[PDB]
Amino acid sequence: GYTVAVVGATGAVGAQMIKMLEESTLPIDKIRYLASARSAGKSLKFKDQDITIEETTETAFEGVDIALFSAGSSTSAKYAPYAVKAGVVVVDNTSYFRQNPDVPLVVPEVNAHALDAHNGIIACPNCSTIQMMVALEPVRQKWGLDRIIVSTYQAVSGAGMGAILETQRELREVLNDGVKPCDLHAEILPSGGDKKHYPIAFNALPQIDVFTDNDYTYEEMKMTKETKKIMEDDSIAVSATCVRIPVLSAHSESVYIETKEVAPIEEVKAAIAAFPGAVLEDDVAHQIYPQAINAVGSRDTFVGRIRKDLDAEKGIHMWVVSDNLLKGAAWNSVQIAETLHERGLVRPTAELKFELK
Amino acid sequence: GYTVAVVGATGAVGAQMIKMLEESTLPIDKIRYLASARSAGKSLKFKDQDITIEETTETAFEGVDIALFSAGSSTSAKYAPYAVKAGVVVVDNTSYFRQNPDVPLVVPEVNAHALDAHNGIIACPNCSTIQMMVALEPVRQKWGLDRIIVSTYQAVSGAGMGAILETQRELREVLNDGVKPCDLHAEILPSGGDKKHYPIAFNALPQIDVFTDNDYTYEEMKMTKETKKIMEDDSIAVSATCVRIPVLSAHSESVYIETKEVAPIEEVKAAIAAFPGAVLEDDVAHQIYPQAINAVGSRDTFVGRIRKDLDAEKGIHMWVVSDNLLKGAAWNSVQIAETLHERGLVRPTAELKFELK
Numbered sequence: 001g002y003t004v005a006v007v008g009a010t011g012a013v014g015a016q017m018i019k020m021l022e023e024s025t026l027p028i029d030k031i032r033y034l035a036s037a038r039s040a041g042k043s044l045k046f047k048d049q050d051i052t053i054e055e056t057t058e059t060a061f062e063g064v065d066i067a068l069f070s071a072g073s074s075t076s077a078k079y080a081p082y083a084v085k086a087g088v089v090v091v092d093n094t095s096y097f098r099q100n101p102d103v104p105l106v107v108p109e110v111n112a113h114a115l116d117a118h119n120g121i122i123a124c125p126n127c128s129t130i131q132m133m134v135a136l137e138p139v140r141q142k143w144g145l146d147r148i149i150v151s152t153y154q155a156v157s158g159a160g161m162g163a164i165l166e167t168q169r170e171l172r173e174v175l176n177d178g179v180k181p182c183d184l185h186a187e188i189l190p191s192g193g194d195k196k197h198y199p200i201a202f203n204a205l206p207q208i209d210v211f212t213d214n215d216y217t218y219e220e221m222k223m224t225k226e227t228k229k230i231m232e233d234d235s236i237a238v239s240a241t242c243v244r245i246p247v248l249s250a251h252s253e254s255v256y257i258e259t260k261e262v263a264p265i266e267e268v269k270a271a272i273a274a275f276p277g278a279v280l281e282d283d284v285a286h287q288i289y290p291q292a293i294n295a296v297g298s299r300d301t302f303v304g305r306i307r308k309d310l311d312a313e314k315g316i317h318m319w320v321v322s323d324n325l326l327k328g329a330a331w332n333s334v335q336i337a338e339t340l341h342e343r344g345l346v347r348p349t350a351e352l353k354f355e356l357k
Numbered sequence: 358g359y360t361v362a363v364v365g366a367t368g369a370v371g372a373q374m375i376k377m378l379e380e381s382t383l384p385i386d387k388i389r390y391l392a393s394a395r396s397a398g399k400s401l402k403f404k405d406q407d408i409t410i411e412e413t414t415e416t417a418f419e420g421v422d423i424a425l426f427s428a429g430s431s432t433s434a435k436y437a438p439y440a441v442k443a444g445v446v447v448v449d450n451t452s453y454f455r456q457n458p459d460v461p462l463v464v465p466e467v468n469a470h471a472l473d474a475h476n477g478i479i480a481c482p483n484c485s486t487i488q489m490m491v492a493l494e495p496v497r498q499k500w501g502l503d504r505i506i507v508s509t510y511q512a513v514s515g516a517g518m519g520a521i522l523e524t525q526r527e528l529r530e531v532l533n534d535g536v537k538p539c540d541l542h543a544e545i546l547p548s549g550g551d552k553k554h555y556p557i558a559f560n561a562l563p564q565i566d567v568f569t570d571n572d573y574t575y576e577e578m579k580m581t582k583e584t585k586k587i588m589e590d591d592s593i594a595v596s597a598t599c600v601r602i603p604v605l606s607a608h609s610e611s612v613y614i615e616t617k618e619v620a621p622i623e624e625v626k627a628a629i630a631a632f633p634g635a636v637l638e639d640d641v642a643h644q645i646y647p648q649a650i651n652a653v654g655s656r657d658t659f660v661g662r663i664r665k666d667l668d669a670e671k672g673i674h675m676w677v678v679s680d681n682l683l684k685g686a687a688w689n690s691v692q693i694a695e696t697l698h699e700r701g702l703v704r705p706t707a708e709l710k711f712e713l714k
């Protein structure tokens with residue numbers, strides 16, 4: 001079997017990586033948990049086995065076959081190249097390597113083939129992008145995609161464990177201490193790395209990540225650029241508005257597309273239902289549609305509210321929901337690893353394409 | 358001065374109708390409070406005065422100059438025509454009369470002129486429509502509008518006092534008692550008058566009102582139809598997705614438009630800032646944008662995240678927030694009443710144009 005390392009084992013994604021690995025078909029001979037200096041020495045379970053968390057260093061990756069990185073952009077930038085040096089194949093959850101042309105950006109149901117040419121690092125895309133790709137790829141295959149416009153409804157777990165706890169504390173101060181939401185103290189959301197912080201309790205914050213020079217946020221531009229790379233078509237026009245809402249887990253998206261040819265709605269529904277990883281949940285007569293709270297804990301991506309635009313001949317609207325820590329991160333990553341195993345791609349790279357920092 | 362009646366004085370909207378009237382410039386000699394048999398006989402303040410609540414009936418309107426209706430479509434359908442017959446000017450906050458060609462559907466900053474031809478009933482549009490109209494009218498004036506795509510983020514108070522209590526109770530159960538959200542029992546949301554009820558705590562529900570036969574909800578179709586009538590332009594293409602989220606008050610909206618002529622993005626910002634009732638809150642360098650929690654208690658409508666679409670030349674995205682009980686309901690209604698008073702339009706109607714039920 002393999003020696004598998006989880007870098008960032010102690011965080012929100014880390015925890016689900018462990019869970020996904022525990023339930024994986026990957027043959028695992030040894031599991032190693034890595035994090036920062038301050039977690040080193042603590043113990044975390046793998047199944048009933050006790051594992052000792054190690055500090056992430058340049059020399060920690062010897063003997064490792066597969067390393068799943070979810071420790072933040074800076075940690076992958078610094079240590080993933082040394083893992084690749086050590087003969088590791090790295091599946092990276094962060095955004096750091098995603099737009100590097102030597103790095104496949106993969107959703108296994110859509111572009112598993114891109115894995116074949118990897119140079120030791122595979123990037124998992126953004127959570128919001130992944131679930132959109134699972135929903136839209138079956139439509140693109142049959143009728144094409146001219147443009148996408150998406151507005152997201154993102155859970156706070158996407159911003160990390162600290163954001164979850166800040167959200168819960170805020171809500172208790174409102175409901176229990178009677179604090180007005182506009183009077184709440186905030187430290188993390190909307191973005192831990194930005195200058196000002198705002199309450200999320202009973203709010204909707206139209207900012208995920210920091211702002212880019214064009215007045216879209218980095219989250220929104222990731223949806224644009226990652227979509228084009230995943231579906232390998234820069235002509236697909238993609239514009240996003242990314243919004244954080246008071247949901248702990250599972251992202252929801254209002255997705256509008258225009259296809260290249262007119263796609264009968266009953267066929268679109270059938271095509272999505274037939275696509276692996278996508279579940280059709282669409283029966284409005286019985287008020288059936290995807291819901292964040294029902295999606296939590298499932299690897300599937302749920303699609304409903306499917307309907308023609310009222311005016312645009314080729315326009316279609318839908319509602320897409322998935323657990324942002326499973327298909328959106330930890331399951332996509334483990335699924336990439338299982339796919340690498342299945343296709344004989346877990347082996348050291350010949351050449352190094354990535355600088356050692 | 359006027360005798361003013363508030364029909365549905367005890368609910369979520371009615372409490373704000375009372376506050377807006379208390380703060381109004383309308384010369385009010387007498388206030389009457391009307392509700393159902395359930396509240397009849399109870400007491401409620403207008404400023405320092407105790408006012409006894411009365412049952413709403415066919416005969417309750419003698420001597421009344423202006424009646425503000427916010428007690429549900431059925432109540433308006435049954436009683437507003439009797440108020441008109443009695444000589445009242447009715448400002449109806451429900452959907453019932455909105456698409457009747459004898460009824461002005463008014464946002465005073467946009468189409469106050471339509472008030473002049475009233476026949477005893479003036480309809481206040483849906484909250485979501487109202488705030489969108491305030492943001493977009495200044496754009497349409499200078500550059501036209503071809504289409505709108507909108508995804509909403511709607512607060513629970515829009516569905517009434519019960520919805521508010523249900524939301525608070527659900528969140529407390531999760532946060533203080535450790536109930537899982539998918540295990541919560543719901544009785545009202547997404548829609549009181551539909552068959553099945555789902556939890557809103559840590560969820561996003563893509564259903565507001567009941568479904569229509571084209572698979573859009575009534576809330577989505579109201580946005581479409583009300584936009585066309587308010588802007589007096591059936592050629593404007595409008596499709597919406599309306600979603601309830603865990604916010605108590607203030608609706609937010611991700612609005613996409615395509616204008617008729619290219620609309621320079623900085624001039625759009627200026628035009629919105631210059632439009633009465635609209636406040637520009639847009640300085641991404643300092644993370645300034647409309648937020649639900651900051652909008653609560655203000656009559657203004659706040660607009661930001663204003664930016665060009667990445668591909669469509671005439672496309673523009675923005676974020677629009679307003680207190681759904683103020684400008685979205687009580688304040689729009691009271692503003693209509695003030696506008697009727699100011700234009701000498703508070704008088705009985707000669708010809709009855711509304712079916713008595």
Ligand SMILES: NC(=O)c1ccc[n+]([C@@H]2O[C@H](COP(=O)([O-])OP(=O)(O)OC[C@H]3O[C@@H](n4cnc5c(N)ncnc54)[C@H](OP(=O)(O)O)[C@@H]3O)[C@@H](O)[C@H]2O)c1
Binds near residue numbers: 056075
């Ligand atoms: N207050 C802190 O800054 C603090 C203290 C202790 C731990 N952490 C980690 O970071 C999280 C704190 O809140 P969060 O919302 O940022 O968590 P998070 O994003 O949900 O998780 C981030 C993960 O990346 C790891 N990590 C961060 N910097 C690292 C580095 N330079 N080298 C190796 N691993 C690194 C963390 O391990 P570590 O837990 O070892 O950092 C953590 O497991 C914890 O969940 C914990 O995982 C943070």
Ligand SMILES: NC(=O)c1ccc[n+]([C@@H]2O[C@H](COP(=O)([O-])OP(=O)(O)OC[C@H]3O[C@@H](n4cnc5c(N)ncnc54)[C@H](OP(=O)(O)O)[C@@H]3O)[C@@H](O)[C@H]2O)c1
Binds near residue numbers: 484
């Ligand atoms: N413009 C908008 O977007 C907008 C927004 C919100 C609401 N509205 C309209 O206002 C209505 C109520 O809204 P809400 O949020 O205030 O609901 P709510 O909090 O449940 O209040 C319902 C109100 O209607 C009264 N009522 C119910 N049945 C009645 C009857 N048979 N006769 C007389 N009064 C009756 C209630 O009186 P009791 O206390 O005696 O039951 C109460 O005052 C909505 O259904 C809708 O039509 C419009």
Ligand SMILES: O=C(O)CCc1cccc(C(=O)O)c1C(=O)O
Binds near residue numbers: 482483484550
């Ligand atoms: O059930 C009813 O009587 C009306 C329900 C309702 C609830 C919330 C907003 C509205 C509205 O359109 O403003 C409406 C409406 O009047 O149709």
Ligand code: NA
Binds near residue numbers: 145146235237
């Ligand atoms: Na295109």
Ligand code: NA
Binds near residue numbers: 632634
């Ligand atoms: Na203004």
Ligand code: NA
Binds near residue numbers: 698699701
């Ligand atoms: Na006058």
